[PDB]
Paper text:
[name] from [name] is a protein of un­known function with a molecular weight of 28.6 kDa (residues 1–­248) and a calculated isoelectric point of 4.65. It contains an N-­terminal DUF2063 domain (residues 10–92) that has recently been classified as a new Pfam family, [name], which is currently comprised of 216 proteins from 173 species (170 from proteobacteria and one each from acidobacteria, bacteroidetes and planctomycetes). The crystal structure of a member of this family, [name] from [name], has been determined and reveals that the N-terminal DUF2063 domain is likely to be a DNA-binding domain. In conjunction with the rest of the protein, [name] is likely to be involved in transcriptional regulation, which is consistent with genomic neighborhood analysis.
The crystal structure of [name] was determined to 2.10 Å resolution using the MAD method. The final model includes one monomer (residues 31–230), two chloride ions, one imidazole molecule and 95 water molecules in the asymmetric unit. No electron density was observed for residues 1–30 and 231–248, even though LC-MS confirmed their presence in the purified protein before crystallization. Thus, they are either disordered in the crystal (note that there is sufficient space in the lattice to accommodate the disordered residues) or the protein may have undergone limited proteolysis in the crystallization drop. Analytical size-exclusion chromatography in combination with static light scattering (SEC/SLS) revealed the oligomeric form in solution to be a dimer, but with medium confidence (∼30% was clearly dimeric, ∼50% was interchanging between monomer and dimer and ∼20% was likely to be monomeric, suggesting that at any given time the dimer:monomer ratio was ∼60:40). An imidazole molecule (likely to be from the buffer) is bound on the surface to Glu114, Asp166 and Arg162, but its significance is known. The ordered region of the [name] N-terminal domain (residues 31–116) includes the DUF2063 domain (Pfam [name]; residues 31–92) and is similar to many proteins that contain α-helical bundles. The surface-exposed aromatic residues Tyr34, Phe45, Trp62 and Phe80 in the monomer, which are mostly hidden in an N-terminal dimer, could play a role in base-stacking interactions with DNA if the functional form of the protein requires dissociation into monomers, but this is only speculation at this point. Structural similarity to transcription factors and presence of a surface-exposed basic patch in the N-terminal DUF2063 domain indicates the possibility of DNA binding.
Numbering used by the authors:
A (entry chain A), B (entry chain A): 31 to 230
Amino acid sequence: LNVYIRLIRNNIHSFIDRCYTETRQYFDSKEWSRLKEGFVRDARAQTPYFQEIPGEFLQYCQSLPLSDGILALMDFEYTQLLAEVAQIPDIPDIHYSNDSKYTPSPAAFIRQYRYDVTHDLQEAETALLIWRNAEDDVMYQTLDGFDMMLLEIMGSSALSFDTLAQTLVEFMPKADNWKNILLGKWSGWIEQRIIIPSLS
Amino acid sequence: LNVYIRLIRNNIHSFIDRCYTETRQYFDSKEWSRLKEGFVRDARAQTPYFQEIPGEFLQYCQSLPLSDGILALMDFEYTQLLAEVAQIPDIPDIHYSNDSKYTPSPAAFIRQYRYDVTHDLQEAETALLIWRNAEDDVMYQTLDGFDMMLLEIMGSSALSFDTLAQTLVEFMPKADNWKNILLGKWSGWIEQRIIIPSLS
Ligand SMILES: [Cl-]
Ligand SMILES: [Cl-]
Ligand SMILES: [Cl-]
Ligand SMILES: [Cl-]
C-alpha cells in the first residue's frame, strides 16, 4: 500500500464527507468511518476518475444496502452536486419572444422519493426539482404534477410558450385567464434558470 | 301598483340582500337601495320566476355597469348560491373501483376572475373551484392549472382513475411514484364531493 494509494484514499474520505454532509449526520463517527473503510476496500473505489467517487459511494451504499430513507437522502445530496457541476450552455443576452423555444437547464433534475429527504426522512411521497439558478446557487423546490409533466415533455422536445399555451387550449375553459397565470409561471422558470433558450 | 306587486318587490329586495351579502358591504345604505330600486323598475325584475331574481340582478348590474371588481364579486356570490341549490344525483353506497368512471359534481363550478373575490378585490388573476361537499356545505378553493384541466376534461367525458393515470403515463417520468400522489388527490376529490360516480 504505497504513498499514492494512501493519498487518494484520504482524498476519497474527504470528498465523501463533503458531498454527503446531511447523510453523515444520521451516523456515528465510528459507523460513518466503517462505511468509508468498506468503500475504499471495494472495487468501485478503484476508479481512476476522482469525479466518479461520490456516485460510486452511493452505489456501494445501495448494494449494502443502507435503509431506504438514507438511500433517498444520499441520492438527493448527489443530485445537488450534479446541479452544482452541470455545464449550462452560454446564452446570448438578446430578446427571446414567446415564439422562441425553451428546453430545461441541463442543471435541472426531477426527483421522486418515498421519503422526505428535505426534512427528516418521513415516509411520504416527495416530488422535487433540483437546479442551479442565475446566481449559480443550487436550489430545490416541491414539484406539483402539472410542472413535472411540462418539464418532462419539454425535456423530450424544446417548446415555445406559444406552442405550450396553444396545445392546452383544448383541455381548458373557454375563458383564457389561465394563459396569463401560465405565462407568469413560465416567466418565473426563466428567471430562476429552470428553463433556458434552446439554441441551435 | 297593487298589493301583490308591492309584496314581490319586497321579496326581491330581501332575496338580493341575502344572496349578495359581501357585495352589499362595498356600498352605502342609500347606494345599495338605489341599485335595487333601479332593478325593480327594470324589465329584468318582471320575471314570473322568483328563482331567476339573483341572476337577473347580476345582469342588471353588468349592464349599468358596476366596477369590474364588484361584478366579479357578484358572480362569485351567485356561484355559491348555484352550488347551494344544485341537484346532485343520489349515489348508491356501494364499492366503486378505480375502474369506475367519475364525473364532476353538478354542484361544482370553475371560476376565473381578474380580481381577488375571496379577499378584497385585488387586481390579481384568481382561479377558484366552488362546490358543495358531502356535509352539504358550500366550499371554495384555489384551483391550480392541472386540476382545472382535469375537471374540465372530466366534464367533457366521464373518466376512471385507471384511464386518467394511464393517459398521463407518457407525459411523466418512468418512475411511477406520481401515480400514488395522484390517487391521493383523486381520493380527496371523492371525499370532498368534487367528483361523483358517473351512474348510467
Ligand atoms: Cl481517485
Ligand atoms: Cl425512495
Ligand atoms: Cl318574483
Ligand atoms: Cl373578472
